[PDB]
Amino acid sequence: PEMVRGQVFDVGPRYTNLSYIGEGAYGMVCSAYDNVNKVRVAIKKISTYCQRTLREIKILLRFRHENIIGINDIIRAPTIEQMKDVYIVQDLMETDLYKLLKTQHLSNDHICYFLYQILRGLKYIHSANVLHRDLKPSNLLLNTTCDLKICDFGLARVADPDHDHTGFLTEYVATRWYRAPEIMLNSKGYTKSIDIWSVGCILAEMLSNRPIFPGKHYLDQLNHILGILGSPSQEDLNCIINLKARNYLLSLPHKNKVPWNRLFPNADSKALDLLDKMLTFNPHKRIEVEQALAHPYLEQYYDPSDEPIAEAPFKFDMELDDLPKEKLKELIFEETARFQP
Numbered sequence: 001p002e003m004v005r006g007q008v009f010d011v012g013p014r015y016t017n018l019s020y021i022g023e024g025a026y027g028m029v030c031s032a033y034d035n036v037n038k039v040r041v042a043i044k045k046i047s048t049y050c051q052r053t054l055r056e057i058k059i060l061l062r063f064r065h066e067n068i069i070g071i072n073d074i075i076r077a078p079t080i081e082q083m084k085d086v087y088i089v090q091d092l093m094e095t096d097l098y099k100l101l102k103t104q105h106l107s108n109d110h111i112c113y114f115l116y117q118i119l120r121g122l123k124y125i126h127s128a129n130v131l132h133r134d135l136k137p138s139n140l141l142l143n144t145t146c147d148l149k150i151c152d153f154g155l156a157r158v159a160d161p162d163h164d165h166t167g168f169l170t171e172y173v174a175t176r177w178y179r180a181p182e183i184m185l186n187s188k189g190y191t192k193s194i195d196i197w198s199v200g201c202i203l204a205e206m207l208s209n210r211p212i213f214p215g216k217h218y219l220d221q222l223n224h225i226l227g228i229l230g231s232p233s234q235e236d237l238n239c240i241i242n243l244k245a246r247n248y249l250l251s252l253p254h255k256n257k258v259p260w261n262r263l264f265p266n267a268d269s270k271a272l273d274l275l276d277k278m279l280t281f282n283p284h285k286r287i288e289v290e291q292a293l294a295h296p297y298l299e300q301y302y303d304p305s306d307e308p309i310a311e312a313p314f315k316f317d318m319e320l321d322d323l324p325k326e327k328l329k330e331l332i333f334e335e336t337a338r339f340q341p
């Protein structure tokens with residue numbers, strides 16, 4: 001079996017000429033030559049498993065969309081007893097939006113096209129009643145021709161708006177700078193509006209190459225958001241019934257709105273109108289994915305007949321959070337069976 005940086009990376013004879021790329025949310029990621037399809041591919045090693053691995057595999061195997069990364073193949077031992085590592089093989093993409101924004105200024109045309117493809121993929125995900133819940137530049141892959149694919153469904157959930165409410169300062173898992181204000185106030189992140197806020201943050205980041213709300217800890221994230229949107233209105237406060245959340249907001253000094261054209265003096269005006277609508281404080285007033293696609297900023301691309309939806313809503317058969325470790329390993333084994341000879 002092949003080794004990389006002193007660690008086993010056992011992808012069978014189909015995949016050769018490994019090159020170490022880095023670490024991801026799962027572990028070691030390499031590229032390799034696929035001797036069947038005659039292209040280099042990306043392979044990630046997954047090494048007591050995590051429910052996030054099963055979630056990712058089940059979703060990605062069910063989804064089929066141009067702007068969502070697929071799973072091409074899965075490598076594992078032929079039996080549960082021998083199964084230790086699982087390797088997930090995917091299209092090799094030149095880069096991701098995190099790397100690209102650290103080095104490259106985007107033209108307005110690239111911003112527009114990237115945003116289109118993000119929302120086109122998101123339309124499909126939300127049409128399946130799924131929330132990605134960790135949209136951010138590093139989860140947006142790009143090829144040499146700037147085709148964009150959304151990746152990492154490890155924190156995804158089925159939408160559940162009727163059970164979205166929670167108390168003030170409830171802990172949350174998803175990446176801090178991309179969290180909607182309501183996560184810190186009264187929301188579990190079980191509604192589609194959670195993902196639109198992340199997309200808004202990504203749009204702002206494409207406009208300036210800097211994250212718009214770089215909070216350094218949980219409540220600092222909310223104070224960055226309020227420092228630009230300004231104090232919420234009476235009406236938007238009245239929507240927050242929880243007293244600890246409400247009263248926290250009422251305790252703050254008045255903050256003025258920072259106009260988008262002052263933060264982004266080089267931006268297209270239609271881009272800033274759409275940004276405003278995605279970065280709306282009140283999640284009920286926030287624009288939805290289909291409205292966003294229909295916004296004038298995206299008029300060159302918008303074509304709902306070419307923005308497909310999922311054939312059916314997605315469902316987890318069992319509730320993943322209460323499965324023991326043996327049942328989780330057993331389910332991963334079953335979900336990956338279709339790739340065995």
Ligand SMILES: *CCC(=O)Nc1cnc(C)nc1
Binds near residue numbers: 024031
């Ligand atoms: C979703 C994140 C991801 O898969 N990123 C990634 C990093 N490196 C390569 C080669 N492919 C994908």
